[PDB]
């Protein structure tokens, strides 16, 4: 039979009133022998009906795929409400069911530290600048880099990972050409997360 | 139905002969009535016979997991020989087969740098020493922390991260306490990797 996938809102959508956070329920591998798919949404037990269900799109398997999308309220998601996608189809013996939410626990405030490049990286052409983010819970974050109010292109950010305390941490490595660091250009690590004041902090690094 | 995964040896294991690099074939969702499970292992198309089907256990899934591990040689796995776990079963339609190998690509030597604690981490009790390993390929790697010969225990390690130049990087956060740093203890990041001379180097860090 068919398979269901329940996708959450990207982190930054739930921290800015500017954005629109949503949950996407996706049914894949729907057949022509009955491609009637029915969506029932529930938040925290009680069913909602404010979901927008796109029409079936057949794929190149020769299989149908249906996407229902439910907008959330930022406070709802951050107050840890559970969202149930329920999928009905006359093939399936029993309706498939999915619950989703942010990961249960107590919010823990991240601590950001910026580390200048190691002295030995001076002998190369492009030095690495480091942003360490520690002690945050849950793990959905957002990290990136700006220099003079404008984003920096060349940085990779490692995923979050469970520390010994049960909270998370990460690093992001921004690679700049040796000159821009030498001159004293100020660089800037910004992070977004529920347990920050106004969901935003930023620390800067410069020679 | 019987689903098959096949996991490669541990990085540390292939770079030091003291250890036993092993390829571990794992079958899942094996149901009581047909659990004979064959295994046959092949190397570069041929076949050798130094396998060892270990014992089993049981999850809350009404099913068990047979697990067979094969001993490998350190100069064959690192030379990119393909490894094949045929898993014959009558519960299965047919012989589900699988094949793994070391990732191909000219190995590249890792860059190892040691990041001392940011000034503003000094407010709080514990301090976090950073180690940055970057520019390595393939992604298999092992990092460890030690002080004056004995291994440190309070560290964590990011997974390899694919950068931009097709190299990988990673970080390591060894948490050392207040005064061990501040007194003058030397801490050391040790990296083991395919392309390192003697598959191992080390980098120090004192205040
Ligand atoms: C026939 O084809 C169809 C259609 O596919 C398309 O058309 C064909 C013709 C080909 O061209 C295809 O190449 C083409 O893609 C196939 O349909 C596919 O079906 C598979 C399932 O067999 C689905 O795989 C799952 O993928 C999800 C993640 O999917 C995201 O990322 C994809 C690429 O990165 C992207 O293509 C998807 O659209 C989707 O993208 C996200 O979409 C949301 C909603 O809009 C959006 O908000 C996101 O921003 C967006 N993200 C990105 C990056 O784009 C993955 O989660 C699944 O893995 C889980 O399940 C596995 C077991 O099923 C398990 O082994 C994994 O380890 C993992 O397990 C999960 O683990 C997590 C924690 O890690 C846990 O929380 C979960 O509980 C656990 N899961 C379970 C079930 O327990 C899975 O890999 C494809 O999405 C789907 N393709 C598309 C395009 O949707 C079909 O299979 C083909 N059939 C045959 C027989 O050939
Ligand atoms: C009944 O229970 C068992 C046991 O599960 C455990 O207990 C149950 C009861 C629950 O409590 C679970 O929460 C718990 O996990 C169930 O068995 C599980 O089955 C699922 C899928 O059905 C497996 O997911 C796969 O995961 C592997 C990686 O698994 C490692 O990590 C797991 C956790 O992260 C860990 O639990 C495993 O033990 C395993 O650990 C490894 O063990 C070996 C042993 O020697 C060791 O050497 C390793 O070092 C060690 N590693 C770690 C990190 O621990 C993953 O490989 C699979 O993903 C591939 O395949 C998917 C499709 O099957 C696909 O979605 C993925 O994207 C990915 O696809 C591959 O991608 C590559 C490149 O990306 C591509 O080239 C391939 O073509 C592609 N292959 C495809 C598409 O097929 C997969 O996600 C669980 O691991 C497994 N758990 C255990 C413990 O075995 C069982 O399913 C249950 N039955 C029912 C009916 O529910």
Swiss-Prot record, chains A, B:
GO CC annotations, alphabetized: blood microparticle; extracellular exosome; extracellular region; extracellular space; IgG immunoglobulin complex; immunoglobulin complex, circulating; plasma membrane
Gene Ontology MF terms: antigen binding; immunoglobulin receptor binding
Region feature CH3, mapped onto this chain: 105-207
Keywords attached to this entry: Adaptive immunity, Cell membrane, Disulfide bond, Glycoprotein, Immunity, Immunoglobulin, Immunoglobulin domain, Membrane, Repeat, Secreted, Transmembrane, Transmembrane helix
Effect of residue 79 to D: In variant WIS
Carbohydrate-modified residues: 61, 156
Region named CH2: 1-104
Record's subunit section: Immunoglobulins are composed of two identical heavy chains and two identical light chains; disulfide-linked.
Protein name per Swiss-Prot or TrEMBL: Immunoglobulin heavy constant gamma 3
Organism name: Homo sapiens (Human)
């Amino acid at each position: 039979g068919p398979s269901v996938f329940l996708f959450p809102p990207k982190p930054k959508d739930t921290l800015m009133i500017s954005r629109t956070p949503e949950v996407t329920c996706v049914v894949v591998d729907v057949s022509h022998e009955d491609p009637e798919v029915q969506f029932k949404w529930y938040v925290d037990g009680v069913e909602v009906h404010n979901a927008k269900t796109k029409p079936r799109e057949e794929q190149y398997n020769s299989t149908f795929r249906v996407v229902s999308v439910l907008t959330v309220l930022h406070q709802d998601w951050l107050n840890g409400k559970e969202y149930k996608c329920k999928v009905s189809n006359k093939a399936l013996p029993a309706p498939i069911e999915k619950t989703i939410s942010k990961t249960k626990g107590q919010p823990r405030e991240p601590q950001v530290y910026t580390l200048p490049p190691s002295r030995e990286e001076m002998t190369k052409n492009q030095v690495s600048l480091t942003c360490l983010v520690k002690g945050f819970y849950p793990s959905d974050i957002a990290v990136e880099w700006e220099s003079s109010g404008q984003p920096e292109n060349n940085y990779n950010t490692t995923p979050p990972m469970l520390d010994s305390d049960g909270s998370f941490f990460l690093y992001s490595k921004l690679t700049v050409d040796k000159s821009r660091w030498q001159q004293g250009n100020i660089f800037s690590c910004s992070v977004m997360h529920e347990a920050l004041h106004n969901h935003f902090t930023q620390k800067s690094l410069s020679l």
